[PDB]
Amino acid sequence: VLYVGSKTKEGVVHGVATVAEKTKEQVTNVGGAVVTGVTAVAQKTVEGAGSIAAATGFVKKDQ
Amino acid sequence: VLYVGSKTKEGVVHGVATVAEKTKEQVTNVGGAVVTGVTAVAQKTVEGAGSIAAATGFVKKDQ
Amino acid sequence: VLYVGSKTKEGVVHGVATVAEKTKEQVTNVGGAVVTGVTAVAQKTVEGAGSIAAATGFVKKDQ
Amino acid sequence: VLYVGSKTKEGVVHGVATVAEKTKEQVTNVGGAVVTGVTAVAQKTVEGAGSIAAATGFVKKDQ
Amino acid sequence: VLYVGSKTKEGVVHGVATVAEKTKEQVTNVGGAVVTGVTAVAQKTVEGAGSIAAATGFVKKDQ
Amino acid sequence: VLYVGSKTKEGVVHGVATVAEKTKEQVTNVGGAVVTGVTAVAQKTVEGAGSIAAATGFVKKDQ
Numbered sequence: 318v319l320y321v322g323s324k325t326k327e328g329v330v331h332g333v334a335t336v337a338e339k340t341k342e343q344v345t346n347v348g349g350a351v352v353t354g355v356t357a358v359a360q361k362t363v364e365g366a367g368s369i370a371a372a373t374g375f376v377k378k379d380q
Numbered sequence: 381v382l383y384v385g386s387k388t389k390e391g392v393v394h395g396v397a398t399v400a401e402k403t404k405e406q407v408t409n410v411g412g413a414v415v416t417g418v419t420a421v422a423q424k425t426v427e428g429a430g431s432i433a434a435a436t437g438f439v440k441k442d443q
Numbered sequence: 444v445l446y447v448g449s450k451t452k453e454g455v456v457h458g459v460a461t462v463a464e465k466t467k468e469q470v471t472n473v474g475g476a477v478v479t480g481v482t483a484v485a486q487k488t489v490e491g492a493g494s495i496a497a498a499t500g501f502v503k504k505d506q
Numbered sequence: 507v508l509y510v511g512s513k514t515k516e517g518v519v520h521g522v523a524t525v526a527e528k529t530k531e532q533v534t535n536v537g538g539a540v541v542t543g544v545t546a547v548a549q550k551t552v553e554g555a556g557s558i559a560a561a562t563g564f565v566k567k568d569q
Numbered sequence: 570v571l572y573v574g575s576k577t578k579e580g581v582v583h584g585v586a587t588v589a590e591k592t593k594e595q596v597t598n599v600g601g602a603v604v605t606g607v608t609a610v611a612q613k614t615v616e617g618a619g620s621i622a623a624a625t626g627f628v629k630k631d632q
Numbered sequence: 633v634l635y636v637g638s639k640t641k642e643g644v645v646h647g648v649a650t651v652a653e654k655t656k657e658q659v660t661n662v663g664g665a666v667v668t669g670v671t672a673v674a675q676k677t678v679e680g681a682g683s684i685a686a687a688t689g690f691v692k693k694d695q
Contacts, residue, residue, distance in 0.1 A: 322448045324387045328424075328487040331395045332457045334525075334588045335482065336649045338401045342468045346412045349472045349500070350435035353480045354416045356398065358432055361391040361454075365429040366491040369484055372476035374412070374501040375437040390487075397525045399586045399649075412472075429491070435476070437501075460588075460651045507570045514577045516676075517613040521583045524608065527590045538598045538626070538661075542606045550580075555617040555680070558610055561602035561665070563627040563690075570633045577640045580676040584646045587671065590653045601661045601689070605669045613643075618680040621673055624665035626690040 328361035349374035391424035412437035454487035475500035517550035538563035580613035601626035643676035664689035 335356060344351060350372045360367055398419060407414060413435045423430055461482060470477060476498045486493055524545060533540060539561045549556055587608060596603060602624045612619055650671060659666060665687045675682055 318381045318444045320383045320446045322385045322388055322451065324450045325385065325448055326389045326392070326451065326455055327453045328391045328485045329389050329452070329455045330393045330457065330483050330485050332588050332590055332651050332653055333395070333459045333483045334397045334586045334649045334651050335459075335461045335463075336399045336584050336586050336647050337463045338584055338647055339405075339463075339465045339468055340403045342402055342405045342465075344407045344414065344416065344470045346409045346414050346437070346472045348411045348437060348474045350413045350437040350476045351470065351472050352415045352433050352435045352478045353470065355418045355433055355481045356483055357393050357396045357420045358418060358484045359391045359393050359422045360430065360432060360485070361424045361487045362428070362430060362491050362493070363426045363489045364491060365425050365427060365488070367425070367430045367486065367488060367493045368434055368497065369432045369486060369495045370478050370481055371431065371494055371497045372435045372478045373437070373499045374472070374474060374476040376439045376441070376502045378441045378502070378504045380443045380506045395525050395527055395588050395590055397523045397586045397588045399521050399523045399584050401521055401584055437476075458651050458653055460649045462647050462649050464647055508572070510573045511577065512573075512575045514574055515581050516579045517611045518578070518581045519583065519609050519611050521585070522609045523586045525588045528594055529592045531591075531594045533596045535598045537600045539602045540596065540598050541604045542596065544607045544610060546609045548611045550613045551617050551619070552615045553617060554614070556612065556614060556619045557623065558612060558621045559604050559607055560620055560623045561604045562625045563598070563600060563602040563665075565628045567628070567630045569632045571635070573636045574640065575636075575638045577637055578642070578644055580643045580674045581641070582645045582672050582674050585648045585672045587648075587650045588652070591657055592655045594654075594657045596659045598661045600663045602665045603659065603661050604667045605659065607670045607673060609672045611674045613676045614680050614682070615678045616680060617677070619675065619677060619682045620686065621675060621684045622667050622670055623683055623686045624667045625688045626661070626663060626665040628691045630691070630693045632695045
């Protein structure tokens, strides 16, 4: 009736300072799923299921 | 009836400073799914399921 | 009736400073699921089931 | 006689990523010297004295 | 006679990621010297005296 | 005669990730010297005296 949100923050990322020094970063996928390198990600949902980094190498649901 | 959102923030990313120094970054996919390098991503949904980095190498649902 | 949220914070990440120095980072997936490298991630859901890093190498649910 | 410099670096700045969010930045000088905001500066000298941010509010060397 | 510098680094700054969030930054100098905000600075000298952030509010050397 | 420097590093700063969140940063100098905010600074000298953050409020050396 009188909802008030003044300085609400929801699913927020701020003030993030990252450094990554690699001489070799090697991914080798052979018939699967791979999820790497997720940085400073924000998500908000209203009535919904939400993933961020979901990995399923594959699925076998024949017949 | 009297909803008020004054300085609301939802699914927000700000003030992000990243550095990535690599001498070699090599991805080798062979018959799958791969998701890399997701930085400073924001999503907001209203009545909806939302992924951000979903990986399924493949699917076998014949017949 | 008179909900008031003044400086609410929900699912928030801030003031994060990370450094990663690797001479070699090698992932080798062979027929599975892999989830690596999740940094500074925020999620908020309203009526929804939400993962962040879910890994299922595969699934065999034939017939 | 056989000086060799192959990949020498001297007075070098690289790979710098900065963010500055200010709602008000106010400097008020009244009869002096002020030095602010020096970012990603490189200097190299050969036989010479070199400052980068030297401040002298004033000098009184009469007579 | 056979000086060799292969991958020498001297006075070097690299891979620097900084974030500065201020709601008010106020400097008020009244008859002096002030030095603020020096970030990612490199200097190399050969036969020379070198400062980087030297502050002298003033000097009184009359007569 | 056969000086060899292969991967020498001298006066080097690298891989620095800093965050500074201030709601108010206030400096008030009244007739002096002030040195603040020195981050990721490198200096190398050859035959020379070198400061980095030297503060002398003032000097009185009359006569």
